[PDB]
Amino acid sequence: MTMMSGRPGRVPLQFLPNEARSLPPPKLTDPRLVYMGFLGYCSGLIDNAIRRRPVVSAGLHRQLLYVTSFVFFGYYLLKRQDYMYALRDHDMFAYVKSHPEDFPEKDKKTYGEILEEFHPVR
Amino acid sequence: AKTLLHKYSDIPEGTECHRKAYASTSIGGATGLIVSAYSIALKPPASFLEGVARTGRYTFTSAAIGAIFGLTSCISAQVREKPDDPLNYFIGGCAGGLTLGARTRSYGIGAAACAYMGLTAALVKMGQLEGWQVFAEPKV
Amino acid sequence: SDAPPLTLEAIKDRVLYVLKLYDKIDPEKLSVNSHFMKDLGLDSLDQVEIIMAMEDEFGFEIPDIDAEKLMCPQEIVDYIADKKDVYE
Amino acid sequence: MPLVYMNIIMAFAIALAGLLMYRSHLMSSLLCLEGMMLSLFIMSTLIILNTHFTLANMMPIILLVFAACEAALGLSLLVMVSNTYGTDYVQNLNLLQC
Amino acid sequence: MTMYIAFILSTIFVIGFVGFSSKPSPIYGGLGLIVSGGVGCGIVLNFGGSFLGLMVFLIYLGGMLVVFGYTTAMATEMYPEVWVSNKTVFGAFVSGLMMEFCMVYYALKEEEVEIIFKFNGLGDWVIYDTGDSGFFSEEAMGIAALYSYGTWLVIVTGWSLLIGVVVIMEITRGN
Amino acid sequence: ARQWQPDVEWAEQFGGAVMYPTKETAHWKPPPWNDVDPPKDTLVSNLTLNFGPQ
Amino acid sequence: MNPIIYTTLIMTVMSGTMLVMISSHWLLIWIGFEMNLLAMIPVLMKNFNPRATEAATKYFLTQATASMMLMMAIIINLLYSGQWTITKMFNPVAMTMMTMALAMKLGLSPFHFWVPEVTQGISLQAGLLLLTWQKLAPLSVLCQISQSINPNLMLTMAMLSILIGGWGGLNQTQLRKIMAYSSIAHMGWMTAVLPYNTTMTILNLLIYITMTLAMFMLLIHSSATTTLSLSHTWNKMPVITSLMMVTLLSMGGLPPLSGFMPKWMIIQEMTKNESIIMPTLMAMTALLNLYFYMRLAYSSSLTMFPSTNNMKMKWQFEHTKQMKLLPTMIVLSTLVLPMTPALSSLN
Amino acid sequence: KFYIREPPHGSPDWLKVGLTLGTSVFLWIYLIKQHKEDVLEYKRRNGLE
Amino acid sequence: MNIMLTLLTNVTLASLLVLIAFWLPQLNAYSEKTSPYECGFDPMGSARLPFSMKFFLVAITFLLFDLEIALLLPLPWASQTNNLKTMLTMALFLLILLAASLAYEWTQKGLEWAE
Ligand SMILES: CCCCCCCCCCCCCCCCCC(=O)OC[C@H](COP(=O)([O-])OCC(O)COP(=O)([O-])OC[C@@H](COC(=O)CCCCCCCCCCCCCCCCC)OC(=O)CCCCCCCCCCCCCCCCC)OC(=O)CCCCCCCCCCCCCCCCC
Ligand SMILES: CCCCCCCCCCCCCCCCCC(=O)OC[C@H](COP(=O)([O-])OCC(O)COP(=O)([O-])OC[C@@H](COC(=O)CCCCCCCCCCCCCCCCC)OC(=O)CCCCCCCCCCCCCCCCC)OC(=O)CCCCCCCCCCCCCCCCC
Ligand SMILES: CCCCCCCCCCCCCCCCC[C@@H](O)O[C@H](CO[C@H](O)CCCCCCCCCCCCCCC)COP(=O)(O)OCC[N+](C)(C)C
Ligand SMILES: CCCCCCCCCCCCCCCCC[C@@H](O)O[C@H](CO[C@H](O)CCCCCCCCCCCCCCC)COP(=O)(O)OCC[N+](C)(C)C
Ligand SMILES: CCCCCCCCCCCC(=O)SCCNC(=O)CCNC(=O)[C@H](O)C(C)(C)COP(=O)(O)O
């Protein structure tokens, strides 16, 4: 089953709806973006290794392009992921609010009133 | 199909051992027929007589396993007066395994089968008791 | 699997079965070491026919040469053993 | 369902069983494929005519077109196999195993 | 039950299918498929589908001719098999005929369910429309709507046919 | 004083058609080095026809 | 074959897949499948080498039978409800027919027999195409009709695929058949979670596709189709063998590599639906795949096999044509697990 | 030196190098501007600034 | 119903002609008379031996070209639609693609018989 494909008001191939602009964009020092750049750098090193070039220093323009492409794609990927999680939370909270009988608020007893069985260790 | 499964399951465990053994025999025979059909399809028997012999051998082995399992499990659940106990199933499973060894004429096969079938039979009983789901219906 | 490990006894049995299937030879008479001409009174064309029967039995071409010498069942067995590489 | 519908469905089932049970010739199996296509055409046409689905009347014709592409494809392969073996027997297609 | 025309045609359809599915020589398989095609054309005509039935019969006749030509070249088999020339072919043919007869008997006098639904018979004349209107043919109008409504269908079908020509010429190249 | 490395006897176990040879499967042969089998020179017979005398 | 004809046939294959994935009409989905098969048959025969003819014939027969079953399922669904839109398949018999037809198209057990033969019969590039691009359309159709799939039949076929792929891969010394059995097992993993969550199916498909692309491009770079031929690569390109070993470890599902992410994400999902025994059996069965990946890693990278004298000649020449997406493919197929939550972008 | 002239040699392909650096710089500038606009739009929607 | 009667009448007349042809004259059939005819000498091989088709590619192409006429036959009815421009565009597109396929087969020697 697909859980949010048929969500009402969804534009087929948008990848970034307008409402997503209400969310704080990921910071450019986001550790996930740094990991994206690290993946780009590793791709550049492996490209040097396969082509039989000095791995660390062969092509700096190529390594820079690798890192830049990975960071550029990762930024929008993080934005979409954050938007989707925000949508999930929004729908969950709204559904809880609109169905009070299914999520009843329960008065909680204190541990001085609850009787738990004691199992000695011996 | 599912009719055989419900025919076996409807009879209470430690009662009417003949009917339970008959139902288990039918289930085993159906399994043996399926195995025979697939074996004939993927491994041709080079003649009609040899194919009939192979099909009869497989079906008889499976039906004997089912009959012996059902009879011993029901009798164990009856003499011990303890239904809903996986031990009966384990004993039944062992008997089937022993029968398999007897049919294939091997101690190693017989010993291995007795331990493995018995454990599986016991696990099936535990799943019946606790409601374990093999094919779980989607819920979330 | 493929053909079984044929033995010298199998070769001898097949050769003698083929020879006893020839009309111009009395079955109880011929031995393994019996010459085709001297003991059995056969001529060259009968030997050629026997060699062709051997070719049919064992399924491999025996040329005109290496057939002018196979003159009793025993040398026929030796020839088949050498060609098929059997020793025991 | 009337008897005609189950007769067409039975024809489809028979043709499928004929395809799935090879004897020797690949051409026989291709004939079974064409027969399955024909049963599908008849069934779809009967359903469309009975319910007066006017636009769907173009659907069976399209179904015919891609039938030919399947036949012409299969025949092509039957040529190549033949050119390898001088025979269209399916037993010769055993170079690749599982 | 009225004149049994549709039922008879459908039964002959099934019989021809059994005939070519028993897999005799492809000559006789082509003959059985031709009989089935003509009978199916008759079935479709009995429901008002004149164009579709004639169209499929014309297409099949042409297709079978190519199959006959190919059979004489690549599926020749010095002693070609007829339905009574081999125990396997005769057995398959008899099994198909018997299964068809058993299914018809089970669905005819009684109302039995085989796979999906059941049938009582009643003749296929029952489910007709009673519609009384029109100076045209609904089937012809629907088929002719292909060039105005079905632009996408025409595009994909034409591309597929052109690709099929290219594909057959690639496959038969060899080298 | 040297680390063991595979030799020809060790490498030959992976050169068959299957990993575990079986009585029936031992007759399977590995595919050709290129995926090209020897051309099956099938004798496609020509039709022999009498033209005349009638 | 002409490069233009090859390009147009590849375009036709992708166009058939796209027509399947963008259509709302059952007839257009069937037409897309037909077009895909028609254009796919000559791609498998690009090099004549009669084994390719055998592979193409087997593939054509299997796919055409599946197409016939698919059309019958469509027609039965139309008969019981005059609907052409791709939806939950109002009739159950038609649903069973479509499930079987799509399983035959994908190669799920017990319809798996054709996959090892076709993969072994074709070239490595054709095998790459067959094992990556050909899975999209049947899986895309299955995702659209998942709410009506009988869980019992689909889960039986998935378990059978996992078991059979694991067992079949153990006996293989040919690399293409190993890839085929890996493909069967991953297909089973894909379809096991389909009735519960299609996002997990898509995630598994993407991870499997990137790993398969990496492995096939690596086997193309070092022109090896057998174990013994791949055992010569260390003496020519050690880096290629090292990356191959890491990718093989990833395909086995070992943490912290990428191939662990799908299984981990599937088991969890199956547990939220109170399915415990099934994920346990699948997880323990994947150890067979791990074993026959590890055997290849032993043969190719972790030990050094004997080489040949003529290999010295090969030391003097470089790989001329380079695959640009191979480094990205390797990195994505190994070092991606920390970015797992990005899967939420797939729903 | 070498037997074959090795056309790819001490003079690097300056068109390719320039294209690569230009693509990287354009991507970085676009990303910086996009982040700036995203922050401004987010603060505008939420009534922060 | 009238067409069925016409078909039955024609088939009955032909079958009756065959029956009179086979039952009216005096038959003297012996093995030499019924032997196959090959101009006075015995045939060497069988007539059920494979017979090469040199026009096999044209034969395969004939299937696709035959389905194209099935596509083109509803044109008289299609010419009655209001969207005449669309119908004309699609009809010309179909014919142009058929002509292009014929041209492609022609240029790549697809119409030449095998030798
Ligand atoms: C870190 C943890 C450490 C644990 C790990 C290590 C320990 C565990 C592993 C070691 C034990 C595993 C071995 C199990 C059996 C494997 C047999 C085998 O491999 O077959 C291939 C092997 C190859 O045979 P083949 O080449 O095909 O045919 C040629 C024959 O070899 C040549 O033919 P043959 O003429 O020379 O001999 C054949 C014939 C002739 O026999 C003989 O020649 C000599 C006699 C041998 C059997 C005598 C047993 C009767 C007396 C023992 C009573 C219990 C021990 C004392 C307890 C005192 C209590 C205070 O044998 C029989 O007829 C015996 C049939 C059945 C009688 C025994 C079954 C009794 C069941 C026990 C019930 C226990 C219930 C709970 C009780 C609670 C209270 C303690 O077969 C054999 O040679 C062995 C046959 C004897 C098997 C029975 C012996 C095992 C006894 C204990 C079993 C329980 C252990 C497993 C537990 C889970 C299972 C449910
Ligand atoms: C949920 C979100 C996620 C979605 C995930 C989606 C799926 C993920 C990936 C799926 C699996 C990928 C598998 C790739 C298969 C590769 C097969 C292959 O080509 O050979 C292997 C190839 C062989 O390597 P090699 O041995 O060195 O090459 C030797 C030659 O093959 C030796 O042969 P040659 O001598 O003949 O050389 C000829 C060569 C050189 O080529 C040339 O010379 C060019 C000359 C131009 C010819 C002019 C032709 C124009 C006339 C034809 C018109 C046709 C119209 C058809 C339309 C009909 C409409 C009904 O051309 C080629 O080699 C192949 C050409 C490829 C053309 C591709 C065109 C795409 C068609 C798209 C159709 C869709 C249209 C819309 C549909 C609407 C609905 C109806 O290896 C690779 O290519 C490496 C793998 C790279 C794969 C890509 C990696 C993943 C993709 C990442 C990109 C981003 C994707 C996401 C984008 C999202 C939207 C923006
Ligand atoms: C190995 C890791 C995966 C690699 C995959 C390839 C990487 C390259 C990126 C591919 C570029 C194409 C995507 C960006 C173009 C815009 C996409 C847009 O047009 O389409 C949207 C779709 O966007 C895409 O879904 C998002 C693509 C993001 C892929 C990354 C997820 C990987 C999983 C997490 C693993 C971590 C890897 C991160 C990279 C290192 C429309 O969504 P919608 O039509 O409504 O849903 C379709 C599916 N439904 C209907 C069934 C629900
Ligand atoms: C133009 C198209 C329309 C024509 C309309 C008329 C249709 C005519 C039917 C076509 C057949 C014409 C055949 C004409 C000759 C008759 C041949 C046959 O019927 O006679 C003999 C039939 O007799 C049989 O030997 C057996 C006779 C009795 C046994 C079975 C018949 C039982 C009927 C009961 C008769 C008792 C009296 C009935 C009174 C009504 C068979 O002899 P046979 O040599 O092989 O064939 C060669 C005939 N020759 C000699 C003329 C060359
Ligand atoms: C269906 C019926 C068709 C009939 C077709 C008939 C075909 C006729 C073919 C005629 C060909 C010849 O005559 S060929 C000419 C044959 N003539 C000679 O060889 C002369 C010397 N004769 C001998 O050496 C021995 O007597 C010998 C008998 C050979 C035994 O040889 P062995 O000492 O080594 O056993």
Coordinates of N, CA, C and O and ligand atoms in Angstrom, one line a residue, chain I residues 13 16-17 19-27, ligand 4:
Chain I
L13 N -23.9 -28.9 -53.3 CA -23.8 -29.1 -54.8 C -22.4 -29.6 -55.1 O -22.2 -30.6 -55.9
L16 N -22.0 -33.2 -53.9 CA -22.7 -34.1 -54.8 C -21.9 -34.4 -56.1 O -21.9 -35.5 -56.6
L17 N -21.3 -33.3 -56.6 CA -20.5 -33.5 -57.8 C -19.4 -34.4 -57.6 O -19.0 -35.3 -58.4
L19 N -19.3 -36.8 -55.3 CA -19.9 -38.2 -55.2 C -20.2 -38.8 -56.5 O -19.9 -40.0 -56.7
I20 N -20.8 -38.1 -57.5 CA -21.0 -38.6 -58.8 C -19.7 -38.9 -59.5 O -19.6 -39.9 -60.2
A21 N -18.7 -38.0 -59.3 CA -17.4 -38.2 -60.0 C -16.8 -39.5 -59.5 O -16.1 -40.2 -60.3
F22 N -17.0 -39.9 -58.2 CA -16.3 -41.0 -57.7 C -17.1 -42.3 -57.7 O -16.6 -43.4 -57.5
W23 N -18.4 -42.2 -58.0 CA -19.3 -43.4 -58.0 C -19.9 -43.8 -59.3 O -20.4 -44.9 -59.5
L24 N -19.9 -42.9 -60.3 CA -20.4 -43.2 -61.6 C -19.5 -44.0 -62.5 O -20.0 -45.0 -63.1
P25 N -18.2 -43.7 -62.7 CA -17.4 -44.4 -63.6 C -16.9 -45.7 -63.1 O -17.0 -46.0 -61.9
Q26 N -16.2 -46.5 -63.9 CA -15.6 -47.7 -63.6 C -14.2 -47.5 -63.2 O -13.4 -46.9 -63.9
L27 N -13.8 -48.0 -62.0 CA -12.5 -47.8 -61.4 C -11.7 -49.0 -61.6 O -12.1 -50.1 -61.2
Ligands
LIG4 C1 -25.9 -33.1 -60.6 C2 -25.8 -33.0 -59.1 C3 -27.2 -33.5 -58.4 C4 -27.5 -35.0 -58.8 C5 -28.8 -35.5 -58.0 C6 -28.8 -37.1 -57.9 C7 -27.7 -37.6 -56.9 C8 -27.1 -39.0 -57.2 C9 -26.2 -39.6 -56.1 C10 -24.7 -39.6 -56.6 C11 -24.1 -41.1 -56.8 C12 -24.3 -41.5 -58.3 C13 -23.8 -43.0 -58.5 C14 -24.5 -43.7 -59.7 C15 -24.2 -45.3 -59.7 C16 -24.6 -46.0 -58.4 C17 -23.4 -46.6 -57.6 C18 -23.8 -47.5 -56.4 O1 -24.7 -46.8 -55.7 O2 -24.3 -48.7 -56.9 C19 -23.8 -49.9 -56.2 C20 -24.5 -50.0 -54.8 O3 -24.8 -51.4 -54.6 C21 -23.9 -52.0 -53.6 O4 -23.1 -52.9 -54.2 C22 -24.7 -52.6 -52.5 C23 -26.2 -52.7 -52.8 C24 -27.1 -53.1 -51.5 C25 -26.3 -53.0 -50.2 C26 -26.5 -51.6 -49.5 C27 -27.7 -50.8 -50.0 C28 -29.0 -51.1 -49.2 C29 -30.3 -50.4 -49.7 C30 -31.5 -51.4 -49.9 C31 -31.8 -51.8 -51.3 C32 -33.0 -52.8 -51.5 C33 -34.2 -52.2 -52.3 C34 -34.5 -50.8 -52.0 C35 -35.6 -50.1 -52.8 C36 -35.8 -48.6 -52.6 C37 -22.3 -49.8 -56.0 O5 -21.6 -50.4 -57.1 P1 -20.0 -50.1 -57.2 O6 -19.4 -51.2 -58.1 O7 -19.4 -50.2 -55.8 O8 -19.7 -48.6 -57.9 C38 -19.4 -48.5 -59.3 C39 -20.8 -48.3 -60.0 N1 -20.7 -48.6 -61.4 C40 -20.7 -50.1 -61.5 C41 -21.8 -48.1 -62.1 C42 -19.5 -48.2 -62.2

